[PDB]
Design a protein around this ligand. Structure first.
Ligand SMILES: [Mg+2]
Ligand SMILES: [Mg+2]
Ligand SMILES: [Mg+2]
Ligand SMILES: [Mg+2]
Ligand SMILES: [Mg+2]
Ligand SMILES: [Mg+2]
Ligand SMILES: [Mg+2]
Ligand SMILES: [Mg+2]
Ligand SMILES: [Mg+2]
Ligand SMILES: [Mg+2]
Ligand SMILES: [Mg+2]
Ligand SMILES: [Mg+2]
Ligand SMILES: [Mg+2]
Ligand SMILES: [Mg+2]
Ligand SMILES: [Mg+2]
Ligand SMILES: [Mg+2]
Ligand SMILES: [Mg+2]
Ligand SMILES: [Mg+2]
Lengths: 50, 77
RNA sequence: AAGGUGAUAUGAACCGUUAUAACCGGCGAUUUCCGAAUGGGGAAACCCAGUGUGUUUCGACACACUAUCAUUAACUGAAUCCAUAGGUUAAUGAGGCGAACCGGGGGAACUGAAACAUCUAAGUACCCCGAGGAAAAGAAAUCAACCGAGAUUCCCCCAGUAG
RNA sequence: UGACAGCCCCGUACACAAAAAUGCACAUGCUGUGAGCUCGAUGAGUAGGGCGGGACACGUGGUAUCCUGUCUGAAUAUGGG
RNA sequence: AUAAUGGGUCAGCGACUUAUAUUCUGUAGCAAGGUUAACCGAAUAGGGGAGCCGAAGGGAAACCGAGUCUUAACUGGGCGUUAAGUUGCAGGGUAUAGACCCGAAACCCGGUGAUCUAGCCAUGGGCAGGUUGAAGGUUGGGUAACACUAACUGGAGGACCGAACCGACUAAUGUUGAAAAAUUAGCGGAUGACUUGUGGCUGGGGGUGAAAGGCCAAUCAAACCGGGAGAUAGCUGGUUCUCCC
RNA sequence: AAACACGAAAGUGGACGUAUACGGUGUGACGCCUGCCCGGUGCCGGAAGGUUAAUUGAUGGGGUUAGCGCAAGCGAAGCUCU
RNA sequence: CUGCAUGGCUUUAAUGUUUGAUGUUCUAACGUUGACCCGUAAUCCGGGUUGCGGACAGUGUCUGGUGGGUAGUUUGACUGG
RNA sequence: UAAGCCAGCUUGACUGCGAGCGUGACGGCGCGAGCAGGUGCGAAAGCAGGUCAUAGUGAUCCGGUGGUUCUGAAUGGAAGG
């Protein structure tokens, strides 16, 4: 569960980095709260074009 | 029933075995939980009775796919 | 087709003999009530309805339809405006029964070991779900042993051998 | 059939018969369905592993192999069993 | 003879089977060979020699071979080298099966039972007649007022005597009964933890139990019906015509 | 959301009760009373220390072999048995 | 003797991390047999809002303890019974 | 002739075999001259394969250890046997 950010956020905030977050942190808060999204190897290209 | 809506995991029967190998019937049943999942693609939460792994699948494949299944298969949800 | 109206079963009254007597076969028609029973109920073969129809005697009764689930559509439509859930209608299909064979979910103990736990009986008996005329299996991430074979299934060997 | 019938009766061998409905084959009509050539693609919460069981003739045994309740988790043809 | 078992009598039925393996005997075929299995089939033929047995043994084995193993090695020693096998058919044994027939007490599985009884739930019914006289009350007496006291009134109680009703202490009768649990004479309770009609709920290692292992349909230290099932029985019983050694 | 009981579970009883309540156990109206023993077994309390499960996997040893060699033997890395 | 103003690729321990133990805080999984709202004239369920609780509780797999609550069994023969 | 007593030197309490016997239902147990290799004591003939003899003991299975080119599931090894 690496995911890519969206806004700032915690000791990793950056509007679009590849972090390595704990899954529960990921699929219970950030994504449902729209602060990140999974890095599904398709996603590692849209925020790897900027 | 204790069936994982994602994997179809259900209880399975096996044995106990003592140090003397006495067999006593028993069941392994799955690590169910039931969990509010955000879809966004429907602006709603859906509670699936899900196994861990069921979760780990949802993590990987991603919810909507999994929801294509279930619906593809007829699961209520 | 010259004789017929099933049997116990006579009798009555009939029907027929050159083709609508009977009898046999094909396809139709009728097909009360209960029973999956399906309009609601219920002590099975009964009680009671909603809605539609029906009456030169247009009341009350008779008949038809109204179960549930699924799929699809249509129309409707909360908390919440959107949107959903919910609700009505409609079209389809399901439901119950049935000898074995078949696949699947569960799964004994007696017994054997000259006792008994491991082991056996045995994945047997039994319960359950499902399907077909057969079921299942099946087109090598298989064997072989440096030579080669070429899906699955069944029969005889291999052998009561190796383990 | 009044006792044991090739020639009494009903049959049997053999040869024939279907107005209708049907099983089975073909042949087509209607519906639904896709064929063909070029260039591609090649089945990941999987294989494998840890724990617990179960299956394989095989009782965990030096035990390959298969299945998975549980926690994990690759390579991708110069690759993998 | 037994006073040890079994048989009232007759008739009919009633117990060593079947299949597949293996070995021995007989017999048959062929013979250092014998024989095919499935299957094909002109279907008891014919085909099919996959295969099985035998012709070589010894050694755990590699391996060697009329020898081989043992040991560094045998004067040796062990097992072998000299006699034929094999396939049918009949029979004697054995193996696997219910394996000669009948018989348990039980264990497991799925069902059917609270029309008896236990307890509980709901809704209805019953208790002739006669006693006892609790709290309380009233009025006099009595207290400073209460206390207390006498009458009268009142009508308490798992209260009293006693029918219906509910019980079941004694005895006799009955014991192939009138009755698989009663009759007669006495006995207990009889406004209560009473008793009763109807209907409901609880299920088998489970119910219910004012507790006896009681009751759960004349069944209870684990109900009944069907099944596993021909459980198993080193025990008891029985085991059928004749003659010869 | 009691303990507790039926129940794979949902649930239900306990109770539409709430410590003057409810379950369990022993004793058994009343009167006068109920002495000694916590070593054993049980129960209650006990944040120290000793021993201790799955788990985690340090280290040591073995197998294989690129390489080294005439071979005796050594054995990188990986994979493995332990 | 060195420094305080001035003169031609570590143990004695601490800033960024990947990682355990304990303690506080948070909400966002999870609980709610609090309250209100809708489905809905409904003490079931669901959805919704909210308060409470909160990474606890509970559950799955694994695991040490306890375990006649329950089950299957064993508990020798000789013998002057 | 001591098997009894004392002393010197010693490892025959040796390895491979074993004619022939005894004794057991059997599993087994016992006695044994002699052959081969190597050894001790003795000048030598010789004697020694434990003790004056008869008790001093435990089948198989499972497993440990050392040895062993005998086996090694494609082949070389290894595991295992
Ligand atoms: Mg009806
Ligand atoms: Mg009905
Ligand atoms: Mg036995
Ligand atoms: Mg080739
Ligand atoms: Mg492929
Ligand atoms: Mg006499
Ligand atoms: Mg007699
Ligand atoms: Mg009753
Ligand atoms: Mg009284
Ligand atoms: Mg009285
Ligand atoms: Mg009775
Ligand atoms: Mg019997
Ligand atoms: Mg049996
Ligand atoms: Mg007493
Ligand atoms: Mg017991
Ligand atoms: Mg037993
Ligand atoms: Mg005895
Ligand atoms: Mg191999």
């Amino acid at each position: 569960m690496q995911v890519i950010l969206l806004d700032k956020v915690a000791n990793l905030g950056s509007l679009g980095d590849q972090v390595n977050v704990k899954a529960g942190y990921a699929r219970n808060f950030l994504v449902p709260q729209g602060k990140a999204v999974p890095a599904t190897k398709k996603n590692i290209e849209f925020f790897e074009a900027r | 029933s204790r069936v994982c809506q994602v994997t179809g995991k259900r209880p399975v029967t096996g044995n106990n075995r003592s140090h003397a190998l006495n067999a006593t019937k028993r069941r392994f049943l799955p690590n169910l939980h039931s969990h509010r999942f955000w879809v966004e693609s429907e602006k709603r939460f859906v509670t699936l009775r899900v196994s861990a792994k069921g979760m780990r699948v949802i993590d990987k494949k991603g919810i909507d796919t999994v929801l294509a299944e279930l619906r593809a298969r007829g699961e209520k949800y």
